[model samples]
Target: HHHHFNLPPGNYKKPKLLYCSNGGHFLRILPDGTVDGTRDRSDQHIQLQLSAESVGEVYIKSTETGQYLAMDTDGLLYGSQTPNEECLFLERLEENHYNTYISKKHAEKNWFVGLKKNGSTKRGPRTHYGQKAILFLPLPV
Candidate 1:
């Protein structure tokens, strides 16, 4: 049997986190914060095929924090707990978008909007450098 949470029947899941792999990490996030994808050396973050289910894979992520849920082949629900990390808040630029869900949790401390856009960039662990005019999207709580 299949189970449904705070999702619909035709909704797709987010990409699996790429940890300790041969390729560099790339994180992607949607404007609405409902979809996310792991960074990879590919143009399209997600691919769907109408030919058959055996050839392609579907990705979906959980909306609830701390719930490590994903879908696998044969249409089954899987459980896993990704390491605890915080989501970063980025400032949206005039052009471009925020496509990465960074593990380094850095809240955009600056809340005042002015002539120039402003935000912060994750430099390293427990440290962040603030800046102005950046394209960032806050994580959904």
Candidate 2:
């Protein structure tokens, strides 16, 4: 026997569902209001993803016990450290690039706060040699 159910008459729109998630489960909405798994742009550090509210995979560059997070432009990080509560928020700048908002208080005291140019001995910017990585915005702490 099959059970029958009644539906309520209301303005209901079917939600557009996507089949993939980002590095931090970040939601990437396409121009058509559709989500493409391959095109989803969850540009954020793995640890930063912990506070994300979308859908995607999460990655941590450092050991589980490490703290701090390295901010990279290529959608990756080089280090890790304990996250500062004050520096935790949501900052939306683009449809794909949204940074995990870190407050001024926490950012000012961020123990693992730093940057390295790619193509260096360690993780940084992407350059072959004699190249430069420029900061576009005023930059956050």
Candidate 3:
């Protein structure tokens, strides 16, 4: 599928804050390269290094753990030291001024970063419009 919007052709130096649509949880990357949704925005693990790849696509890496965000065929979100096709994501900008990162490996599968009932980040099909897949809030300096 083709998108109307275009992503800037450059690397993002500033890390981004991924705020979970489900409550006050923030997407975080643990020291061991584990990805999860935490309620603490102050945690350094919540910072993500976004690098522009192609149009509307980017590679999300953890600023704290130095690991790239990846999704498998089973829709499992994790961190990888080596970025391949599974590490690419389509930045689907929403009307609410937030962005939803759809997995490139499973573009037709609607796999995105969704939150579980226990506030954990999980990769699954989009349940709502942009509730589970939204992110992009500025972090505190």
Candidate 4:
């Protein structure tokens, strides 16, 4: 049985990687409490998840760490044990059929979860919905 919190009526099952279309990299949270974008299919990308509800809204975390993916005030990323509005990301399907995750709490600020051209994390300030850096594909592991 899953632990039900005051969270959404959703279930995060299975493991997968959010593959970056920018440079074929994958997103991951490592053992050192650091977030990394691996250039290829790496171990760090093996435990990411999203809710099955598909409500276009969700929180992200590495199954191994259980710490939520937190978007800070100025487009910086952090991992937090507590879940807040800053942790909620809107899953928007773009025209290219790939996906874009916008910080719902920071939507007005246009915060996005994007990766750089060589597997680095892209800050949300310079991110745009149609940009190549913000595009991602749900890749099952």
Writing each residue's lDDT as its tens digit, candidate 2 over 63-113 gives 222333333333233343445432232222212222222222323322111
Q: How much lDDT does each candidate structure score?
A: 0.24, 0.23, 0.71, 0.71
- lDDT of candidate 4 over 51-127, digit per residue (tens): 53236677787777887776888786667676777788877766537777788778877778888887777777988
Candidate 1, residues 76-115, lDDT tens digits: the string is 2222244222221122222232222112122233221111
Compared with the true structure, model 3 gives a TM-score of: 0.82
Q: Each model's TM-score, in the order given?
A: 0.20, 0.22, 0.82, 0.82
User: Where does model 3 exceed 4 Å of error?
Assistant: 2-11, 126-130, 133-141
| Residue-level lDDT for 110 in candidate 3 | 70
Lowest lDDT 10-residue stretch of candidate 4: 1-10
lDDT of 1 at 74: 22
Please give, for residues 1-141, the per-residue lDDT of candidate 3 as tens digits: 734353323346678777766665777778786788888768888888888787678888888878898887778788888889999988766654557777878877777766664667665654345464445443432
The clash number for model 2 is 17
Best-to-worst ranking by lDDT: 4, 3, 1, 2
Error of 4 at 8 (Å): 18
Q: How do the candidates rank by TM-score, highest first?
A: 4, 3, 2, 1
Candidate no. 4 TM-score? 0.82
List the RMSD of every prediction in angstroms.
15.6, 17.8, 2.9, 6.7
